[PDB]
Amino acid sequence: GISRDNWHKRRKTGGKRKPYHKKRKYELGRPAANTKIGPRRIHTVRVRGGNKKYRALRLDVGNFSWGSECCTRKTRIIDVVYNASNNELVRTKTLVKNCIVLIDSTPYRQWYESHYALPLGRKKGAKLTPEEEEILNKKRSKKIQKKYDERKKNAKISSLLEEQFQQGKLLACIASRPGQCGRADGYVLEGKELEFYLRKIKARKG
Amino acid sequence: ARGPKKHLKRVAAPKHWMLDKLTSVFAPRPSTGPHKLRECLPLIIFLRNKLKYALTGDEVKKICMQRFIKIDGKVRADITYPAGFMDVISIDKTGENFRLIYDTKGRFAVHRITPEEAKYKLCKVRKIFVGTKGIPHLVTHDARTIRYPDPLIKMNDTIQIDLETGKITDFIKFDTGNLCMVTGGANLGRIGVITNRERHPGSFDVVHVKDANGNSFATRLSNIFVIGKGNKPWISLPRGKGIRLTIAEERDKRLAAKQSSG
Amino acid sequence: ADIQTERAYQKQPTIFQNKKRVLLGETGKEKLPRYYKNIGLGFKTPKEAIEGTYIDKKCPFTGNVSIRGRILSGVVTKMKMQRTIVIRRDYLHYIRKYNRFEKRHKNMSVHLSPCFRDVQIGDIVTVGECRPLSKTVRFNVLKVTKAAGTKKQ
RNA sequence: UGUUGGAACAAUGUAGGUAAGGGAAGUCGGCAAGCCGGAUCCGUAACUUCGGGAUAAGGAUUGGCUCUAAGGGCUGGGUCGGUCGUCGGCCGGCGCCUAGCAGCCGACUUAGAACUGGUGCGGACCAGGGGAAUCCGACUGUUUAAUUAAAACAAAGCAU
RNA sequence: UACCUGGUUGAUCCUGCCAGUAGCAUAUGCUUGUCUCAAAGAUUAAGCCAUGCAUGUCUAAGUACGCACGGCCGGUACAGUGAAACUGCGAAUGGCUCAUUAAAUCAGUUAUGGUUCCUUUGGUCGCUCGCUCCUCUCCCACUUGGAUAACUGUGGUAAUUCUAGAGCUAAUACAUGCCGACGGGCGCUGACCCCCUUCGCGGGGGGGAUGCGUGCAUUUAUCAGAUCAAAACCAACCCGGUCA
RNA sequence: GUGGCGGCGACGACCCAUUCGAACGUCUGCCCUAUCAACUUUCGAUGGUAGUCGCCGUGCCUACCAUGGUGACCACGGGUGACGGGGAAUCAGGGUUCGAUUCCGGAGAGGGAGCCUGAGAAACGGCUACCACAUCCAAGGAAGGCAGCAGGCGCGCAAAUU
RNA sequence: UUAGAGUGUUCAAAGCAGGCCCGAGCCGCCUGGAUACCGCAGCUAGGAAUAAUGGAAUAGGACCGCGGUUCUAUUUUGUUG
RNA sequence: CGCUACUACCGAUUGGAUGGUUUAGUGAGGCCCUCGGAUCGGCCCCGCCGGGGUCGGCCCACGGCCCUGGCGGAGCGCUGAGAAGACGGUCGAACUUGACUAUCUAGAGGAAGUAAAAGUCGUAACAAGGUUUCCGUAGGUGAACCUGCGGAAGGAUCAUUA
């Protein structure tokens, strides 16, 4: 019933616009597809001119990216922490564009431990001995052992991101519109904008 | 009001179709082919009035369906197939071939041409359109998306296509020293060398033209269509050679031939 | 406060602030490199919009708005609500019956480049067309045009 | 428990309550009791001495439990070397709490949101029935202690 | 065809209107013999509706056992007409009237670098590439599933373009899905192996078994996208021709 | 007893195009009224950041801030016995009046609202309710929209043959 | 639609029609359906009288002069780095 | 001012009739969502045959392993399709009552204006209209009007000799 009209509100000149037609099909709205965290449930919508839309109601995995290493992976969301539009959209655990979530760090850590072969998690020394020692060392007559040494240096992750990997969660904005496309895809947070976003979470409570 | 339109009334239809007022109410509505309404010529009106081979729609209905009409090499089967600039059409049963270019007033004059000129045609481009896989693409007046052209093809040019496989041969670039014929607008159907193109960033780029008769005019870049190199047109032109004559001058020609052929 | 005002994080999308990977000689250098696209039609991109630190979403030279179609002028009158100004625009309408003109005026809102303090009121400006920036914000400001008939150098 | 107790539970009382349907039909008369009753948010007429009328009339909300946002105080400014007992008085040298940030405390408040209840929610108590007119007196005030609280006296104003 | 007359006064001049004069659109009276064109339920009631028509669709090129005709033709299927009926397209075009509507609609002018578009016309449509079962078909691709319709057969209510229950049947309807495209190709990991040369560590220079991903759109992120005028350093020794 | 064979009908994908248009915009243009001089609002009234919805651009909608837009060059509110325009009557030069009317654009099917199918309806010779007027009835229920062509009713100064 | 050109609808109102040449022998010819007008607003380009409006007054135009900081590369032995 | 007709007005009824816009309450219906599970098909735990391979079997009666057409009992046990219906949201016609506004109307009694024919009382104005006329303001009188204060001449003097 809702319409995205421009003829139901006053002019700039304070006057009132008497309409000259009843509500029209080619300008229409539908209730919000306010998608939460849960089992993957994406339900269909048909729109004008075909090109049927896919709208999401409950999502858990998304194609979040790590911008400082040109790598991206599928990753299981586990939280929602901060939305600049509403406050009542962080209690509800909703999901919308530019909604700061906590993604699972498992694929990225695993990838890091396989790319540069430098450990990124150690609290109990539980695991992670066999693979890392092997790969850095010789395996095809001294060729590879050179190129991993090039990567031993310049392996960068800030303590702003180092502590998150130790903790298993990565702050990550969403940059894909879950309501209309359905995919909860975005980027991980790092650098200064991580720093700015970190303080807001620290002292949001007021 | 609720969707497409499917009834074109009388002389509300384009004026160059050369129609009446007391043939009822409606006019044939072209089938949305390779040209706009306001540039095309329905194939039906080319068989009742311009040619006067037939009498009614029916006698036209049975001709086009008997598969004698040939447009652009492959036969058509709709009564109202839009025609357009530089389109070749052939009649194999009687043996003629028409060219259908604009007159000096704009009427799509009947123009019989030789089978040699019935092979190719001249088509302007609209955008060089390099697409997926690094593949260069073109578009022409009649919506021929030609892949893989000569890279020198840039804009406003004229191509020559064999009318069996497209495959442009013998292109001519847009330059400021070449013949060009104006299509569309009040200046419809004059011929002359360009001699100028005064640019206007953000609006219609006005192109002046000087004629071989010494006269001059100007149009916008869209209405320009190049039909040859130098002062040589690739195509023969009808009587008058597309050179506009004032109504005073056209009056003289009418009076002289009077009582001299009938 | 006194520097920026925001709830979300504002940045130029095209630029990627987090290219910072090398420690080597300097961890940080000439940082968050600038993005700017010049409009055509000869309008000179102000030096403020090149070396500036501000971030804007609809700035003609440092945003995504696409100026086209209509270019007009005006006389600025108000320096009210942030990031847009209100310009009177005087012109004459001709009455057919009499052989005489009749003055009118129509004043409209236009966005601004937030580069700018030092845009006084009552001064001419050249304004260009744009996509419908807001309910009543269509035209956008391209370059201001009056400082000589004013105070000290 | 106001100068006494015990047993029962009749009428008439005295003092409290409720009652199906109609709602002043009762009566000299709406006498008596009965509705409205606090607060927040909207809305407010005829008249007028322009101050009032006005809480005019007329609406909506009110519980719990879980949150959200906003409204404040006190303290602050450097490695370095020697002297003096990188911490400090001193020196010299630096910092320049430089955009105003950082840490510790502190009272009750106001606005919004989610959920829940047999839709109950100023839950006892405290707490206005309204509207349209007429007569009289301007008003606030006073009086017939022990039947008359008024339209009676006073009253500022006016005038002899 | 840039036009004026009667009227205040005993008479005159003028301001001024009243009345005249012609066209025009509707009504109306009287009258009307021919022909050629031609308006016609707008004004008030965007008030009311009996009655009948105003939206159907077939080509060699989606379905064919009505038995409704007709094949001669019963044989290892389907003459051919063919009404029904499933499917696709059509009803969103035409016609009516002006109740709304005062920068609203609409006219002239422009951008849609800010979107969608059945159909007509042009383009591509060797998409990826990697399993073959138990002791005997992994799997159909030289064809993979069941379902309703008309049709037959029982009915229901007073009634309608109302439908239920039972038995078969097809696809260009709803679904399922395959060597072939036989990737030699390509990029990342990449057992290694080989030489020059460093005792050696080392560096250069080589070719590579294994395994993963494969421009067909959607979604997100990152990269480069020009270099317009020039000569030397330390320093990799590299593309090269001159004697050395 | 096998492998290759052209012409076509139908078909779906879209950086795609081309056409058919459709939709929100840009600048200027409207009749009478001051016995309409101040209008607009947290409930979007002008704007900013972020975002759901939309086919997209935008207060379109929600949150959080900012306090703003128009108006004597006539806003605002009212009236029209006003659909707009191409045009029409009248005329020396200016003009005054009229435009429902067959072309272009808009709105509608008794008043409103909602929605399925479809690329394109908020379609009504499509459905869903409500309201008023209503047609069959076994009293249990069913169906409709002549501001389409003819017709009749009522209306009238006034308008055709089922 | 207004104007207007060409044309004998018997004239005209109209309409965009029609005229030859012969039994027909060509296996037909010649042509028509134009032009002006269409403010105001927008685009374009010559004219610069009249009318707005501008410029160095507490310094501003001119001289490719000789100096600093700060950076963006083209390409020379280093093909690339 | 016993003198009628018409036009409009104020007016107690704190009046009536119609629209039109709205606050508030109730809110049928479609749509989105969270549930839902009448019913309809496939799977697997079972038995038996025939089809082919198979141990015991020379092949077979029948059995063990696999696959298949068919036969039946049972877990309805795991899975796809799914209507009726509901909590909630959204849009929201309509009804009931308030406010606002508009045009039209009945109303005792009062007071205007116009036309009436040959009415009664007067004579105010036009001649120095017999008090010179008129303007402003104020009081009074049956009525035109009279008077007081200041003006104008549209006055009956364009002027009156130191």
Side-chain angles (χ1 to χ4, degrees), chain C residues 97-110:
Chain C
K97 184 204 186 75
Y98 319 96
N99 283 323
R100 283 148 173 102
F101 300 77
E102 160 190 337
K103 284 191 160 83
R104 305 188 174 198
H105 82 272
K106 280 177 173 180
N107 43 7
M108 75 181 158
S109 309
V110 291

Side-chain angles (χ1 to χ4, degrees), chain B residues 157-177:
Chain B
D157 310 284
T158 302
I159 62 171
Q160 192 202 13
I161 62 184
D162 60 353
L163 205 71
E164 281 76 350
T165 187
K167 190 41 203 182
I168 297 105
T169 70
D170 306 325
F171 76 101
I172 62 186
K173 173 78 184 182
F174 185 92
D175 199 335
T176 310

